[PDB]
Design a binder for this molecule. Sequence first.
Ligand SMILES: CSc1ccc(-c2cc3ncnc(SCC(=O)O)c3s2)cc1
Length: 284
Amino acid sequence: TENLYFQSMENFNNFYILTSKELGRGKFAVVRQCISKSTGQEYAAKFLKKRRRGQDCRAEILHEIAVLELAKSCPRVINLHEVYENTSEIILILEYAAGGEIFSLCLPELAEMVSENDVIRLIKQILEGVYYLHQNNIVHLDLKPQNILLSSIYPLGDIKIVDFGMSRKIMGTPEYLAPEILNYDPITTATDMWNIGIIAYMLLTHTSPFVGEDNQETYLNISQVNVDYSEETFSSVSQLATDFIQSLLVKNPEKRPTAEICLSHSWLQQWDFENLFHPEETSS
Ligand SMILES: CSc1ccc(-c2cc3ncnc(SCC(=O)O)c3s2)cc1
């Protein structure tokens, strides 16, 4: 009895070809690389099932599409290109973020080529995107590093925030949940700022700030905000980076700075050495 809204599957297959590339995303909302047959341009195709856990999800998918559409003008948020639909799926044709996940730069596995200068730039770009979301009363609520992508890694490109499946107005992965989520306090923009704190910590230390031996220990670490700031873990991390993280990883969401205040943090203030600085004392 369900009528389809978006462009037909026959049109999808006419205009695009799926590639064999493995994108390492979920088994329940598959994301595949695809190519426009006309232009050769690469896209990501995300296949969202309309029925999940015995529930109709089409309204929720429609809301997610509404959020991506509102963020079209923000280059820090993945762009939505087209939408298709078949019996069981709504397919989002997304801008392809060829660098993959920022998570890859946070690995123990990686002996690293990521400088503090690069971290500063990535965090600044993340903050630009989240500022834009918060200004439009959207809280992402799933800003794990797996949901922040890169336009490239060689060289290091630009940030693309993805997956607005949990986004709201003003049950994630345990280690990424803010303390207010664990207390069922209401949703605040401050929850996203907590996650930015985690991202910075992981980029700089290549370790998870809260994860424990098991979920019970993870929840203990989060609700107590028990974070390793030891000299060993932070011997190659600047005080200013430490300050930025510590201002975000605080229990009380109301004490966390806004994305806007973060963008003014001293850590992020940097002059591009190839530009001619104009000092306060002028030549006249
Ligand atoms: C293993 S190398 C690799 C390279 C690129 C990518 C991806 C590119 C890309 N561009 C847009 N969206 C996505 S995931 C979107 C979503 O999960 O909601 C993705 S995942 C993932 C992995």
